[PDB]
hepatocyte growth factor
Amino acid sequence: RNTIHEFKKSAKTTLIKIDPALKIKTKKVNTADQCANRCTRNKGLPFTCKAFVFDKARKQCLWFPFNSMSSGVKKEFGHEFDLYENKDYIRNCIIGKGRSYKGTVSITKSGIKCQPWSSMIPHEHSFLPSSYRGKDLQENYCRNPRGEEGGPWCFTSNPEVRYEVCDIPQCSEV
Amino acid sequence: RRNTIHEFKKSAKTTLIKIDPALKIKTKKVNTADQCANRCTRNKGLPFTCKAFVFDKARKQCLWFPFNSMSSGVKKEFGHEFDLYENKDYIRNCIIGKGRSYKGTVSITKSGIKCQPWSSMIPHEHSFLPSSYRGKDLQENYCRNPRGEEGGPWCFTSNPEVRYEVCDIPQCSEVE
């Protein structure tokens, strides 16, 4: 029963533990799925498994008690790496205008699937990841790169509808 | 067509009734609740963001919704033939204050110990019966803070040696 799908994947990335206080359980393994379930089930791990980098080359897992947003770590490239962040630890509600939203919702308020940011079709635009470094304009996730009034949005996969806001809840709704 | 049903928090014998006559809904006769789930996760052919769905077992019908139990203008109701499945991307996964209202599904203590089900007395015997904390959602082995104590969500651990331990659930300030 694999669970990688409940992980937000960042291809060719990895985190750096430059603070020796939080650990990093490392282990030899065959597939990334194996890293997934061990993190999801939190088995043999002395902490809350929040993220995991699977080293494609040396074929092993790096179970982390933190993720790319933890105050202390840093993320870098490597074609041989794949980062997986447990979604329970990626905030799923927005605060304010959602400029910091790094969730994975990729459907607009009307239910239309979002167009990938790196794509110019069906809608040509200038919100390239390259122009909005730090904004995580990855995949087709709803984002608010310019932090505008309106909240997270995305260009839609429907040719007739250029963009639409997404239906992401404010954290302050009780 | 992978079964997406596990990415939903299930509340058995529960359905949602919309108090706001304007909330959208879409239904359809299917065969299994797995069908409701896959369609809800893919958001295929639904005119809103699918945040939850109810499977009517008596009619074998999916009721897809753009709201969940925590939405305003909606009410929970008991029902033998209904099961409620809530999409986890819409159940707040951080806590405001002490976490009294936390309804997420984290079931692991901050030390990595799997929680003990609330309705179980093994390994730890306790007086936290769900029935006496209605509205508290003491279901499964989810980390909860029924009495709203400082220190936030906690659970009885399945470690016979550790009676209970708090959970590692981030503040939405932003735990830092």
Remarks:
- The longest helix of chain B spans residues 33-42.
- Residues 1-91 of chain B form a domain with the Hepatocyte Growth Factor fold (CATH 3.50.4.10).
- The first strand of chain B starts at residue 8 and ends at 18.
- Helices of chain B lie at 33-42.
